[PDB]
Amino acid sequence: LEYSELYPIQNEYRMMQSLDGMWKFQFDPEEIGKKSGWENGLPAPVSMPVPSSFADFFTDHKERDYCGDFWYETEFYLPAEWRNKKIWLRFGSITHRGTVYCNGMEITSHEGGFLPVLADISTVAKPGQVNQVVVKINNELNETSLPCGATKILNNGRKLAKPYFDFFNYSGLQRSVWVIALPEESVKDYSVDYELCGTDALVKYEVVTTGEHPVIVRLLDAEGELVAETEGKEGILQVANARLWEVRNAYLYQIVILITDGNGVLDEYREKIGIRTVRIEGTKILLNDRPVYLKGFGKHEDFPILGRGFHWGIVKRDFECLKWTNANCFRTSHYPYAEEWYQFADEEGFLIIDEVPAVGMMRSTRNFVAAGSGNYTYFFEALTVPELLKSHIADTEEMITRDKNHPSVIAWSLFNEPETITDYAYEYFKEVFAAAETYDFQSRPMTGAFEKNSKPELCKCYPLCDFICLNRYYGWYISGGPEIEEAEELFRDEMDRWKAKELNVPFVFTEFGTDTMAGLHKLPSIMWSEEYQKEYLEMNFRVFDSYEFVQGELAWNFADFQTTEGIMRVDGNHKGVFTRDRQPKAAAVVFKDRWE
Amino acid sequence: LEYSELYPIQNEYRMMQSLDGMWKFQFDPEEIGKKSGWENGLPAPVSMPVPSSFADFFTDHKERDYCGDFWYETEFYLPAEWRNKKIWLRFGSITHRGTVYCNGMEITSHEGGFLPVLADISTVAKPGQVNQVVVKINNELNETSLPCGATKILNNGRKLAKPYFDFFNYSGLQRSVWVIALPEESVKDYSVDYELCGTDALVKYEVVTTGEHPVIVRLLDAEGELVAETEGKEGILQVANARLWEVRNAYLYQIVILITDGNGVLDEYREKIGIRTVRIEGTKILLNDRPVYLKGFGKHEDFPILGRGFHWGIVKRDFECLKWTNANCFRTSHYPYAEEWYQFADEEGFLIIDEVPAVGMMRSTRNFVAAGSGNYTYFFEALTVPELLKSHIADTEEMITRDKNHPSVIAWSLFNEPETITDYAYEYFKEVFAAAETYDFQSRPMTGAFEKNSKPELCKCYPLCDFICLNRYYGWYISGGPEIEEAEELFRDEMDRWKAKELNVPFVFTEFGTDTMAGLHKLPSIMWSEEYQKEYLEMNFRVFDSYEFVQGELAWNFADFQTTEGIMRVDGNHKGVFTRDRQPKAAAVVFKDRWE
Ligand SMILES: O=C(O)[C@H]1CNC[C@@H](O)[C@@H]1O
Ligand SMILES: O=C(O)[C@H]1CNC[C@@H](O)[C@@H]1O
């Protein structure tokens, strides 16, 4: 990467100033902004909170559902004392793609809506003056970038996003924005990897800087005491009597990376890390050499009004709920979350399966969204797939570079419900997995979540995985309700087929659930009732517990969340175990009791 | 009584024809019906279902809330073959009071809205012709009849019922209406009482007829086989190897009462009865000589649209729900129910505490409903109480005469939450209890439900009871929510005071509960949430289980039910364990599991 993914810090060498607040915002349905000079200021803006998704503020459909180009603008005073620094705009994300301007000048563009965008404004920044940032953003969906979908043009020319995925197309500036100042020679990246040696541990590391001066690396314990120190851009820190980062029992050291010229220090980067190992051994997931059974949820970045907008309050409530259920794990379904989620998981000892936004790659869904009105003959995969692969690999590189040093991150999920039953899909995913392994200094477990279409007899992609994640809805989409006994039979039949393959890898259920409307009670239960959610879960548990190789269960979903409206979604997806405002349905206690 | 309470049957001697259906109905706000000849036909009626409460059909407030005089009318063809019979109109009830006319002639009047009204139309009936019935009904509330309340006159002259009780003032013809034909000499009443003699049983009986001819009494088993036979209006039936009626395990014999003149039979009455004994022994409630712990609910006659209207479907669903909770008992809070409820309890082996409508006799409530707008000085108890007592005793006599022969009925509840802390209240209730014992051939246990105001140090009436029923809301009305630990302390303090009295009688909690809005979930719980209902119940159980003498628990209420609207009632009373359409809230399983 031609920029650093490192989270920004404030110290003697590095400065940061938040640009969060009310920005100026303007929709550009006619796509006239750039030729009209909007990069120098929006002509008729409204106010827009940052961070937030824009959609749910408005009271009219066309603004909520807006699809196309739209622009953000703000101004900030740059301290004069930042003069002799490399000055960057850092967006937590720009959803889905955008071009950043500063003081009227084009700085950078980015594709991918869920990872940081770094824009080097050093050459146009005006220290000791007010500066301007303008961002052109686009939220259309296509088949050459993630997540996948289509864009429909309505009779009036109005665009409408048509996802191939089951979540609302929230977009905008959904995460915090900073302007930061770095030393001219700085720490750009580092990687740690761990080895356990009895009571001791080794922290292997690499550091990438933007210069040639010597590097010193120190490790401090949770009290700030020096426990190890070495020199060089590559090395090993030896930690006596190491306090390991444990599941639901975190311990964090602080790594301190210094660039020196002998006379003094040029840069200092510090970050909390946790000494822990993760590996797959047969059907076991080993954390610090001991098996762990994953218990938790797929989540979303989703909350009323804010949409995917980041807020520490959502983090705090969600973790309190997670702990109350006795969970130990979540998957970042279906995109990398704001960095703060991982920082907090590190502190709380939660395990994370970190997922790239490779969702929407199922052919039947694509075809369905094309058949709506209307198309049944024209598709061009041969042309788009190579471009999609490039985008997928780029997002993977960005995710892993951003997240690798979190002790919480124990696995990469490289897809959710793609086509996997052709040799072509194998060749596609082989490249993604190869890239992931190359970018991950730890070479930690890699996986993806498979839809039921990936039958054990047909799937060509599970051998790429270190463990296999299954999304299954036996008792919801398949043989629901009065047919639930048949659902259980079908589920056991499938798992018997997996069993007979004797793959000797762990299986984790990454999704299972039922839409459940809080307050819908029925005796006997019906699909959509709270009681049916409980019974469905009990049936699933009986199945899970029948197979030795099943080593985790992440329910879909932690909480009800927003989707595109339609005949199958009653104000979003109601498969939450909690409501959207984070309160438990009856099924939450079922998990609490089982996971205790 | 100058009529029979016996449920109507169809045989060679007795005939019955249902008058249920759409009747004619007219409100009489100006109170002009009788002087205008409405007893000969209503001049501008609308259609009204019978059985039903009238209120919830209408779409306008004034009709729903109507209070005052209103009239019903129907016509029926009387079979010519009924010529030589005593012909009666039998109303399951007329709520609250009314006068029955037939063919333009005044037949009878009745005060009390929850027990049968019998009108002898023999002298005006026209066999082989169409006949007419017209009923003038009034639904006002006062302090000289049950249940108690007031009637407010609004500025326009419009009346409004102001109950002193927490249920909606439903009224009309809420139960089935029959026209029946009896022999000129008939069985008017009978009573059975049981004694257990090892494997055998004795059925002591009395029969009252309207003549002097000899009586023969037979007992048939459940297969119709004769197991005992004797002669005389008083006698004992000896039953070898008797199959006792047991809790949740009913067995019903059929008693057959014949009047003969030697040549032939003049009348035959048959009814199912169950051989069982009930007595209080120290702190134990003994059913067939074995202790039973009561588990169940207070109910209501309440269902959407029908109001208190009787329907066997409500009975069937409610009993299935009761059985699913593992209940064995209900109280007919706060009025005798339709007879069919008891017939079904007999079949299902449920225990019933049968309650007369002596509810609304708390002074604070009376004063409150008077202070509303407006009165704080004028009350006239010295004058009304003697009339109230007469009404209360009459209703008690009617209830016991109607219900005594149901094996399900194991106790009479003679009040719900009256004043009990004065010697005057003692003298009042002494008369009611004396009357009850006189009317009950079995002299079975007598009780009433006490409000918290009846402190152990102050109450003068509990010594009248064979067992004591307490309604308590520690954790709802007293120290709810964040104060629930204090509520438990206060509850234990009160029960410690009862304990120290060493009364050596059983205590049954006849009410405890929390308003709970289906679908309101919160973590941590709040008052009104489903989770709080569960926690409140668990706290109550801990208290109940701390006292040896507590021998039953009937939760308030089986199901959400209609009340007068107001700032404390969110579409009725939500203390149901089930919703009004009979579906379980989370707390229902708490009962199911405990009562199993
Ligand atoms: O249909 C569902 O509820 C889920 C199916 N698997 C993918 C999820 O994004 C989706 O939300
Ligand atoms: O307040 C309540 O919920 C109850 C209190 N005891 C009497 C009931 O009729 C009433 O419904």
User: Which residues touch B3 (CB under 8 Å, ≥6 apart)?
Assistant: B88, B118, B120, B188
- Minimum-distance ligand to the CA of A168? 1
Query: Is B111 a residue of the active site?
Result: no
Distance CA A552, CA A509 (A): 6
The alpha carbons of chain B give a radius of gyration, in whole angstroms, of 24
Q: Which residue out of B316, B516, B523, B585 would a mutagenesis test of the A interface target, given it has the greatest number of A Cβ atoms within 10 Å?
A: B523
- For B300-330, the three-class secondary structure string (H helix, E strand, C coil) is CCCECCCECCCCHHHHHHHHHHHHHCCCCEE
Distance CA A284, CA B288 (A): 60
- Ligand 2 pocket member B511 (CB < 6 A): yes
Count the alpha carbons within 13 Å of A291 in the hemisphere toward its beta carbon: 11
Name the residue in chain A with its Cα closest to that of B587: A586
- Ligand 2 pocket member B166 (CB < 6 A): yes
Q: Which helix (H) or strand (E) holds B428?
A: helix B423-439
**DSSP-assigned beta bridge partners for residue A254:** A220, A272
Q: CB contact, 8 Å: B570 with chain A?
A: no
DSSP A95: B
What dihedral do alpha carbons A98, A100, A105, A107 form, nearest 10°? Answer: -100
**DSSP-assigned beta bridge partners for residue B195:** B202
Q: Report phi then psi at A310, rounded to 5.
A: -75, 140
Which of residues 315 through 334 in chain B touch A, CB cutoff 8 A?
A: 321, 324
Residue for token digits 């509840």? B413
- Cα distances (Å, whole numbers) of residue A383 to A144, A295, A419: 9, 41, 17
Nearest to B522 among A517, A531, A583 (CB): A583
A 10 A CB-CB count for B585 gives: 26
In Å, what resolution does this model reach? 1.3
Which of residues 398 through 417 in chain A touch B, CB cutoff 8 A?
A: none
Q: How many CB pairs under 8 A join A and B?
A: 34
Report how far apart the first and last C-alpha atoms of chain A are (Å, whole number): 43
CB A293 within 8 A of CB A247: no
Q: CB contact, 8 Å: A531 with chain B?
A: yes
Experimental technique used to determine this entry: X-ray
Closest protein CA for atom 7 of ligand 2:
B166
Distance CA B359, CA B106 (A): 31
What dihedral do alpha carbons A203, A204, A210, A214 form, nearest 10°? Answer: 80
> Quick check: helix, strand or coil at residue A63?
helix
Closest protein CA for atom 11 of ligand 2:
B166
Q: Give A-chain residues touching B558 at CB under 8 angstroms.
A: none
DSSP A185: S
Out of B419, B511, B530, B553, pick the active-site residue: B511
Count the alpha carbons within 13 Å of A52 in the hemisphere toward its beta carbon: 18
- Ligand 2 pocket member B440 (CB < 6 A): no
Distance from CA of B586 to the nearest CA of A (A): 7
Distance CA B539, CA B476 (A): 12
The alpha carbons of chain A give a radius of gyration, in whole angstroms, of 24
Question: Considering only CA atoms, which of B76, B183, B141 is closest in space to residue B360?
Answer: B141
CB B218 within 8 A of CB B258: yes
CB A17 within 8 A of CB A74: no
- Cα distances (Å, whole numbers) of residue A488 to A468, A472, A500, A556, B356: 20, 11, 18, 18, 52
Distance from CA of B325 to the nearest CA of A (A): 11
Q: Give A-chain residues touching B584 at CB under 8 angstroms.
A: 521, 523, 531
Distance CA B335, CA B332 (A): 6
Q: Which residues of A are annotated as a binding site?
A: 166, 334, 416-417, 477, 511, 556, 569, 573, 575
* Cα dihedral across residues A316, A318, A321, A327: positive or negative: negative
- Tell me the pairing of strands B550-555 and B507-511: parallel
Decide if B584 and A520 are in contact by the 8 Å CB cutoff.
Answer: no
Rounded to an integer, what is the distance from CA A188 to the centroid of its chain?
22
Nearest to A584 among B324, B521, B579 (CB): B521
Question: Considering only CA atoms, which of B163, B182, B184, B162 is closest in space to residue B16?
Answer: B182
Query: Is B417 a residue of the active site?
Result: yes
- Tell me the pairing of strands B351-355 and B329-331: parallel
Ligand 1, CB within 6 Å, residue ranges: A 166, 334, 417, 471, 511, 556, 573, 575
Of ligand 1's listed atoms, the one at least distance from the Cα of A473 is 5
What's the helix, strand, coil split of chain A in %, to 5? Answer: 20, 35, 45
CB A562 within 8 A of CB A168: yes
Q: What is the DSSP track for B368-424?
A: HHHHSSS-SS---HHHHHHHHHHHHHHHHHHHHHHHTT-TTEEEEEEEES---SSHH
Decide if A321 and B523 are in contact by the 8 Å CB cutoff.
Answer: yes
Q: Which amino acid is at B582?
A: R
As to burial, measured by CB atoms within 10 angstroms (0-12 exposed, 13-18 middle, 19+ buried), residue B155 is exposed
Nearest to A523 among B324, B518, B519 (CB): B324
CB A78 within 8 A of CB A87: yes
Nearest to A324 among B324, B523, B586 (CB): B523
**Cα of A259 from ligand 1 centre, angstroms:** 47
Count the alpha carbons within 13 Å of A504 in the hemisphere toward its beta carbon: 2
- Cα distances (Å, whole numbers) of residue B58 to A121, A250, B170, B559: 72, 64, 13, 23
What dihedral do alpha carbons B364, B365, B369, B371 form, nearest 10°? Answer: 10
- Ligand 2 pocket member B516 (CB < 6 A): no
- Minimum-distance ligand to the CA of B561? 2
- Minimum-distance ligand to the CA of A335? 1
Question: Considering only CA atoms, which of B178, B182, B181 is closest in space to residue B209?
Answer: B182
- Cα distances (Å, whole numbers) of residue A13 to A183, A186, A220, A412: 6, 9, 19, 33
Q: CB contact, 8 Å: B585 with chain A?
A: yes
DSSP B122: T
Could you tell me the maximum CA-CA distance found in chain B, to the nearest angstrom? Answer: 78
Q: What is the DSSP track for A18-46?
A: E--EEEEEEE-TT--TTTTTGGG--SS-E
Distance from CA of A588 to the nearest CA of B (A): 11
